[PDB]
Amino acid sequence: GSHMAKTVILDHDGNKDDFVAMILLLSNPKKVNLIGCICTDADCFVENGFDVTGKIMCAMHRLIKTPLFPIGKSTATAVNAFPTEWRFSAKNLDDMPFLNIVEDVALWEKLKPENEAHNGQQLLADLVMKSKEKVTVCVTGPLSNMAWCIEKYGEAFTSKVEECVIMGGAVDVGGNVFLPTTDGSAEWNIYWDPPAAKKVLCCPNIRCVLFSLDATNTVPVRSVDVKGFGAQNQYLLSQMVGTMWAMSTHEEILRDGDAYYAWDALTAAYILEPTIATLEPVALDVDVSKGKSEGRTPRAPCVHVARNPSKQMFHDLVFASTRVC
Amino acid sequence: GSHMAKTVILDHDGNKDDFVAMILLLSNPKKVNLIGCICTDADCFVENGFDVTGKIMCAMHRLIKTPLFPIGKSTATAVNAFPTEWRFSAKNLDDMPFLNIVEDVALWEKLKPENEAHNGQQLLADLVMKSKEKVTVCVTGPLSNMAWCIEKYGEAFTSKVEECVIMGGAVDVGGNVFLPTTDGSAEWNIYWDPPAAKKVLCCPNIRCVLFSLDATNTVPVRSVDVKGFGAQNQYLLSQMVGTMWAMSTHEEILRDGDAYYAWDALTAAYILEPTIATLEPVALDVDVSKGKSEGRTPRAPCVHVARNPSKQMFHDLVFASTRVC
Numbered sequence: 337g338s339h340m341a342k343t344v345i346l347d348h349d350g351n352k353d354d355f356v357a358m359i360l361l362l363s364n365p366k367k368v369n370l371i372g373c374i375c376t377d378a379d380c381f382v383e384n385g386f387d388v389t390g391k392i393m394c395a396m397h398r399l400i401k402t403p404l405f406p407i408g409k410s411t412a413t414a415v416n417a418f419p420t421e422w423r424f425s426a427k428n429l430d431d432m433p434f435l436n437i438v439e440d441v442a443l444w445e446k447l448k449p450e451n452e453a454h455n456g457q458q459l460l461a462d463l464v465m466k467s468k469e470k471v472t473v474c475v476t477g478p479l480s481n482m483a484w485c486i487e488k489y490g491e492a493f494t495s496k497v498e499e500c501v502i503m504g505g506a507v508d509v510g511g512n513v514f515l516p517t518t519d520g521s522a523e524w525n526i527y528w529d530p531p532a533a534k535k536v537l538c539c540p541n542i543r544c545v546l547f548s549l550d551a552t553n554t555v556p557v558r559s560v561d562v563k564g565f566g567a568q569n570q571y572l573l574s575q576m577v578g579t580m581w582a583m584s585t586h587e588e589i590l591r592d593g594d595a596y597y598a599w600d601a602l603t604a605a606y607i608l609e610p611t612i613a614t615l616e617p618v619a620l621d622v623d624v625s626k627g628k629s630e631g632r633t634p635r636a637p638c639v640h641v642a643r644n645p646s647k648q649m650f651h652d653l654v655f656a657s658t659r660v661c
Numbered sequence: 662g663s664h665m666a667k668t669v670i671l672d673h674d675g676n677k678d679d680f681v682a683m684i685l686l687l688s689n690p691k692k693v694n695l696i697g698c699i700c701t702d703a704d705c706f707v708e709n710g711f712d713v714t715g716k717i718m719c720a721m722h723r724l725i726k727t728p729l730f731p732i733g734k735s736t737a738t739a740v741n742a743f744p745t746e747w748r749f750s751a752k753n754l755d756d757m758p759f760l761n762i763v764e765d766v767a768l769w770e771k772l773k774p775e776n777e778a779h780n781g782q783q784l785l786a787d788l789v790m791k792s793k794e795k796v797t798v799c800v801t802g803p804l805s806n807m808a809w810c811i812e813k814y815g816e817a818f819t820s821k822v823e824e825c826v827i828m829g830g831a832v833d834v835g836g837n838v839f840l841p842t843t844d845g846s847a848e849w850n851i852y853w854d855p856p857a858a859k860k861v862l863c864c865p866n867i868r869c870v871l872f873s874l875d876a877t878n879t880v881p882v883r884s885v886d887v888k889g890f891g892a893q894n895q896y897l898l899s900q901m902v903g904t905m906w907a908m909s910t911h912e913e914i915l916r917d918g919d920a921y922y923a924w925d926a927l928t929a930a931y932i933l934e935p936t937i938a939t940l941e942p943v944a945l946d947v948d949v950s951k952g953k954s955e956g957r958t959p960r961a962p963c964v965h966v967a968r969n970p971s972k973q974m975f976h977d978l979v980f981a982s983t984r985v986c
């Protein structure tokens with residue numbers, strides 16, 4: 337009546353934040369049975385994102401005996417690609433000492449061929465449709481994989497989704513896509529593939545919970561907090577998350593307040609702690625045009641938008657989860 | 662006859678590479694008695710560079726009982742400042758879990774006020790002039806501090822310098838300063854303050870050993886090597902160096918071969934292992950103009966230029982040093 341874990345798939349795109357989200361999900365087996373991961377070539381180079389996902393899976397299997405699970409590289413392609421500099425973070429992570437423990441590298445190398453054979457879109461569809469229980473899909477990259485599954489399988493897929501908890505969009509606040517060809521109103525995950533986001537967010541047959549910039553703006557990644565991992569450096573997961581966050585704490589200074597945030601991590605935290613935010617039903621009209629507002633998610637119900645997230649609950653959950661091992 | 666350590670001061674500017682160099686020096690007390698560090702506001706923000714230097718000093722004191730030493734922030738100012746993005750690396754390091762162990766942070770906080778009172782230029786002068794033995798100065802940032810000391814104190818300073826081992830310049834190869842106003846012939850440490858470099862490099866009263874891009878081009882920082890730290894992740898110094906290097910392994914891809922190198926680390930390695938490279942006496946003519954070649958170090962003896970460094974010896978020294986603790 338509270339003692340059974342939710343079945344979850346993480347559909348991510350391999351930035352630092354994506355991996356913090358993976359760690360939060362995977363480190364909490366009482367609450368989450370992570371049955372698969374999809375990695376998309378969006379805010380990473382997919383081979384690096386794939387390898388980091390595999391090595392984290394292997395490390396956690398070793399330390400706390402969470403099951404192994406299938407991992408698939410999506411073949412989704414960008415409409416509007418991420419900045420190249422951002423996409424390298426998974427390469428840096430692949431090279432970190434905490435991600436190169438000999439035993440973990442060896443297990444991943446053993447498991448890699450079976451996973452390499454997966455198509456990520458097909459794997460998402462298969463895991464959802466074959467699962468005994470309805471599945472929560474946590475989407476922390478673009479919506480391309482969910483769109484593909486909806487288009488191919490319709491009800492046979494949507495009927496098996498418990499809910500889809502998505503990082504994307506910006507409803508009543510500005511976006512984060514600042515390019516010569518954009519007006520600053522759009523958020524990157526939507527902007528990468530706007531038609532896919534339009535197809536999913538207003539699909540009347542799935543419950544979507546949307547962590548847009550409205551909510552994620554509450555959780556900038558800041559030195560004062562990140563330094564807290566030092567007290568827990570004996571835990572591998574604290575080495576991991578602390579390093580992932582420490583790589584990003586300068587961005588708020590660099591960009592004059594436009595921080596690196598715990599975007600995906602907060603999204604995953606909702607699955608672990610549904611009282612972490614309040615939900616507001618909202619109808620959205622996703623901009624799929626080629627004009628300056630491409631990818632905007634203005635108000636036109638399509639989704640349940642997260643509001644007023646608890647910074648304290650988030651903090652506590654991250655620090656506790658990173659003491660698991 | 663081989664059992665006595667060299668007295669060394671590190672005059673650095675706080676990029677990742679600078680800290681690897683510090684670690685190599687400090688982790689080898691049989692060979693090096695590190696009696697002080699200077700930090701310059703060049704390839705870092707000096708407060709972050711100061712704090713990282715202090716915390717590394719404190720961690721090594723805790724683990725292997727190397728002495729504490731004075732640290733001073735230079736007040737030298739840029740002629741041509743570093744790219745802002747590069748300068749943030751010391752902030753990221755300050756926030757890393759391996760640099761936030763409670764005991765280390767506490768000791769540094771205790772020692773910080775006495776160090777804050779130092780002027781870095783004056784401290785360099787004082788440590789050299791008061792040392793019982795002649796001092797090797799390892800210069801891994803710009804030459805501003807050495808220039809200041811030479812100008813103020815002349816022979817009383819230069820006579821107490823054993824040798825000055827400097828990372829800078831590019832003699833028979835291209836530079837690394839690529840800006841709209843430059844021709845690509847200059848190296849950054851020289852370019853930051855060309856008049857200071859002119860004053861030191863051709864000072865006839867000090868032995869200068871120069872690790873220019875000619876030599877440092879042998880040691881790009883690459884994933885295949887950096888992943889080797891995983892096998893030694895139980896060692897704090899391997900967590901440190903492995904992370905410092907893992908933060909940089911994408912740059913060779915990003916810049917189409919123009920890698921992040923072990924520039925300063927190789928420079929420090931020469932102090933530990935003087936047979937690591939061969940020396941060629943060369944007269945240089947440092948360009949102090951405001952034209953496109955500003956900061957170039959073309960051939961006009963001023964210095965002993967390092968040639969044909971041993972990649973294998975370097976590798977072995979770094980991996981061994983990072984198993985010290």
Ligand SMILES: Nc1ncnc2c(CN3C[C@H](O)[C@H](O)[C@H]3CO)c[nH]c12
Nearest residue numbers: 351353354422476503524525599600
């Ligand atoms: N400064 C930044 N660095 C890297 N990625 C991003 C992104 C794109 N991503 C990063 C998170 O994983 C999240 O899923 C999404 C936020 O727009 C926006 N700003 C970024």
Ligand SMILES: Nc1ncnc2c(CN3C[C@H](O)[C@H](O)[C@H]3CO)c[nH]c12
Nearest residue numbers: 676678679747801828849850924925
């Ligand atoms: N890609 C890069 N990132 C950061 N700093 C640099 C520099 C400046 N520094 C970095 C090393 O500490 C070295 O002392 C010097 C090399 O020009 C050149 N290229 C850089």
Ligand SMILES: [Ca+2]
Nearest residue numbers: 349354476477
């Ligand atoms: Ca993401």
Ligand SMILES: [Ca+2]
Nearest residue numbers: 674679801802
């Ligand atoms: Ca340097």
Ligand code: NI
Nearest residue numbers: 337338339340
């Ligand atoms: Ni129960």
Ligand code: NI
Nearest residue numbers: 397398401404
């Ligand atoms: Ni097993």
Ligand code: NI
Nearest residue numbers: 406450451454
């Ligand atoms: Ni399979």
Ligand code: NI
Nearest residue numbers: 561564651655
């Ligand atoms: Ni706290």
Ligand code: NI
Nearest residue numbers: 662663664665
């Ligand atoms: Ni001896």
Ligand code: NI
Nearest residue numbers: 722723726729
């Ligand atoms: Ni002591």
Ligand code: NI
Nearest residue numbers: 731775776779
């Ligand atoms: Ni003093």
Ligand code: NI
Nearest residue numbers: 886889976980
């Ligand atoms: Ni090796």
